[PDB]
Point group: C2
Chain length 434, copies 2
């Protein structure tokens, strides 16, 4: 039965200077697309999120790494595409707030309810709403959360924590900034304490710093959150070797991989963009970061490991993978990173035939690709792309709708204009979560 093609090749087909040369299509999509459509139940969902990765950021990364007529074998290979909205709510008025932050957006797709800038897992009345991971887990499904940023960061945090502020990282900052959530005040705990209670089968990322914090109440008081994790049965892993030896990870043995104190390392380094840096400075070539290491797993590696462990669950799985860390090279390199994770996800999804893979961003950032002769009011940098031509980028969250792309069962629900909260109901209905 015609089981779902991925976009094969959408690179410029020939000589870009010639008629028909820059075409990305070799024919008519109608029947490929017809076979891309299935409404049958998604057994697994993999959701890949690029921090700030709107259309402008995908274009600049393609231009740099693949060349303008190039194609990301992961990000651009998803057959169903649409645009979605992500406005937040002003807390006092409940009126729309056109420019969201990462917390409210992360909340909108994990719980399906709009909230205010700064909130995680709570609506504007500070009430908690259940996340898609809490719900997958309640249904007996394996669950995993992966990031290259701090695990306390808004996108990973929003699946496991419910606090009135994204800053309530650990006990210290919670007593002070989220009193109603402070464990001492009967609240549910900080983002890191709620993480530990939440017991996702696979959690992997940065942010080991706040795990050194110590509990102020509860049966693990005085112990640090790392000690509590181990005390609760988590198998901790802190490099690529240990992650690779892990054979099983489940509710009896939750894997928790902490690979960086803050954010895990950035793939490429470059100079900072400067005022008139395109006029007054050379075109940049990005340097691979020497200090990324064979000890530190990559986002693609974490993704593949997580898929390996989570797929042993005979009921299905949910997995969120976040690709996060005026530095254009570091920006572009993280989109390359994520593309490799999407690729792996698609590799699994095609083979399995019952996985919805979704790639999108939390919200748009402010860089634009601009004409190389520009006198911007800002920070620019000219870059040497794959094409041997220079691209100037110019430099903060923005409110623009952005791309969401999908492959697999129920992916039709991302085509057209949707809203970020619809993603929760799409995933929930795909997974049959009742």
């Amino acid at each position: 039965t015609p089981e779902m093609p991925v976009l094969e090749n959408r690179a410029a087909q020939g000589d870009i200077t010639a008629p028909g040369g820059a075409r990305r299509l070799t024919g008519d999509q109608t029947a490929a697309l017809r076979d891309s459509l299935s409404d049958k139940p998604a057994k697994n969902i993999i959701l890949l999120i690029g921090d700030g990765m709107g259309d402008s950021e995908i274009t600049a990364a393609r231009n740099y790494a693949e060349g303008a007529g190039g194609f990301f074998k992961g990000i651009d290979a998803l057959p169903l595409t649409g645009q979605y909205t992500h406005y937040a709510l002003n807390k006092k008025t409940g009126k729309p707030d056109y420019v969201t932050d990462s917390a409210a957006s992360a909340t909108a797709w994990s719980t399906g309810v709009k909230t205010y800038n700064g909130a995680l897992g709570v609506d504007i009345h500070e009430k908690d709403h259940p996340t898609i991971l809490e719900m997958a887990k309640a249904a007996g499904l394996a669950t995993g959360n992966v990031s290259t940023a701090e695990l306390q960061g808004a996108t990973p945090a929003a699946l496991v924590a419910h606090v009135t502020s994204r800053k309530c990282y650990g006990p210290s900052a919670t007593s002070e900034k989220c009193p109603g959530n402070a464990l001492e005040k009967g609240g549910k705990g900080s983002i890191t304490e709620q993480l530990l209670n939440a017991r996702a089968d696979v959690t992997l990322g940065g942010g080991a710093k706040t795990f050194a914090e110590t509990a102020t109440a509860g049966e693990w008081q005085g112990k640090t959150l790392r000690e509590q994790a181990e005390a609760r049965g988590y198998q901790l892993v802190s490099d690529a070797a240990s992650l690779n030896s892990v054979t099983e990870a489940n509710q009896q043995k939750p894997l928790l991989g902490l690979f960086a104190d803050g954010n895990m390392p950035v793939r490429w380094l470059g100079p900072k963009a400067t005022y008139h840096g395109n006029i007054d400075k050379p075109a940049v070539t990005c340097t691979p970061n020497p200090q990324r290491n064979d000890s530190v797993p990559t986002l693609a590696q974490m993704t593949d490991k997580a898929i390996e462990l989570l797929s042993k669950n005979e009921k299905g799985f949910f997995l969120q993978v976040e690709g996060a860390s005026a530095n254009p090279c570091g920006q572009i390199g993280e989109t390359v990173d994520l593309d490799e994770a999407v690729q792996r996800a698609l590799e699994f999804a095609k083979k399995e035939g019952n996985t919805l893979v979704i790639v999108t961003a939390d919200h748009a950032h402010a860089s634009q690709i601009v004409a190389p002769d520009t006198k911007a009011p800002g920070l620019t940098q000219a870059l040497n792309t794959k094409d041997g031509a220079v691209m100037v980028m110019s430099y903060e969250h923005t409110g623009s709708q952005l791309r969401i792309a999908a492959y697999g069962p129920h992916a039709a629900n991302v085509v057209g204009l949707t809203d970020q909260t619809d993603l929760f109901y799409t995933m929930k209905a795909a997974l049959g979560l009742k």
Copy 2:
């Protein structure tokens, strides 16, 4: 009984502060989407181009005019959506120039070949290439060209002119800037002269000022290009009353409507954005432009008259419609609202007819960004009171980002995913069965 659906409503379905209230979907989309897939031939194509309307401009205009949970009934209603690239090429090297201008992007979807910035209907070796309008016309189809900007502007002109510089509006300018296209030098003429030769069945837009120039050579030397068009059998209309009087337009009697000397008047008036304008000035509400007129045909009126006159052709039609007419948030949003009225008209037609492909996209993305109210940005900003009674701040060039392309109809499936601007030429070719 099959009919292909348009998205009747993807507004937030309820209370946006409550669970499920901000959903734009009320259920599963699969079945509606397969009912939207058809490879059958398209009899007609209506292509609407939003001048600079990338995803930021669509969102900014929806928030202001419809509210954040709102829905543009034309623009957001097209069920098959994708993203397309639109880079130009460097003329000297043939290497990509990541940020196109209007001329080079207009050449790419009308001719299918990439080119350099400033070029109309010629490739980087200055070779002319048939535009999709010339080929539809060559095949016996009715063709139309409507704009709110000057007819000599990059987007309407790319359909009918082949010149080495977009600035080659009329005799004067072609002689000095495009001397290899100057009519008194054996070239094909200015944009206006080639427009007159291309003899599309309906051409409606602004730009009457250059028709006041006199030709330098040829059969109509010394006559103005307006006297020429009359002498060549064109029916000229210059206001809404006479436009609605036209009964037919075809090759014997072709319609040319010149409603303004330069661009047609802007829908909404508002101040220009300003440095620290979102903190130093109150929020703006856009007001109707007094000069927009009763006498001046709106873009949905022109689109509607064009479809009427063009559907008299037993064989089908091709129609391109351009919404265009200075860091002014209200003119900018007014024109997206304009174009959305035009898209609803095209879509009522297409939905009724059953064999029309409607594509709505932009030539290239512009640079306005929706920012946070309290932003201290280095450009020009302005705060605006939206339909929600909330403030939206806008910040201010062309940019290189890929942008939205959306479609409805037979062959509309070929806009989904990542395509390139020149793929649009081929999707039109193939839909329409050309060549």
